[PDB]
Structure formats: structure tokens, C-alpha cells
């Protein structure tokens, strides 16, 4: 049976906050298609060959 992910529990409580003190710079990629192959057909040549 597949596992959705690692279990977690945030220690929520009023009059309590968490503040980061350091940072990290991340570079990520992303690929997107743009165009496909341009093609053409000849009707009579394909249907009735010579």
C-alpha cells in the first residue's frame, strides 16, 4: 500500500511564534513544450499511387 508521506505534527500554541534566522537560495528547472513537427500530405499520391 502506497504511503502518502512522512507524518508530521506542528506544535501549535497561542502566545508562541517561530522566526527563521537563516536563508537558502534555490535554483529549480521547469520544462514546457512549445511546438510540434510541421507535416503535409498529398492526397492523390497517398491514395492512388501512380
Amino acid at each position: 500500500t502506497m504511503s502518502l508521506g512522512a507524518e508530521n505534527s506542528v506544535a501549535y500554541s497561542n502566545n508562541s511564534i517561530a522566526i527563521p534566522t537563516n536563508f537558502t537560495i534555490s535554483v529549480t528547472t521547469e520544462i514546457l513544450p512549445v511546438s510540434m513537427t510541421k507535416t503535409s500530405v498529398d492526397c492523390t499520391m497517398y491514395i492512388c499511387g501512380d
Binding site: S40, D42, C43, T44, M45
Partner: protein, 49 residues
């Protein structure tokens, strides 16, 4: 006449093939070698009764 009109706009058009090319006919077959023995029956000296 492939767009079926008399006025064409600016651009590039992909036409068809209307030129006609004459053609001949040809036929080939193997070597006729194994003939039948017709001479023995049609050119026999004596025929049976």
C-alpha cells in the same frame, strides 16, 4: 485552377500535380524450355486402327 478561382492573395500556396506523363507497357517471363512431345503423336509413321 487548383484554388478554383481567378484571383489569388499574397502568400505561398501548396498546389497539386496536373502535368500528365505518358507511359508505356512492358512484360517479362522466364525461358520457355520444356516443350511437349507433339511431334511423336502428330508425325508418327503409323497410326493405330
Amino acid at each position: 485552377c487548383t484554388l478554383k478561382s481567378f484571383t489569388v492573395e499574397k502568400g505561398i500556396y501548396q498546389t497539386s500535380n496536373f502535368r500528365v506523363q505518358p507511359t508505356e507497357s512492358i512484360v517479362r517471363f522466364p525461358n520457355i524450355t520444356n516443350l511437349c512431345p507433339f511431334d511423336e503423336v502428330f508425325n508418327a509413321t503409323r497410326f493405330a486402327s
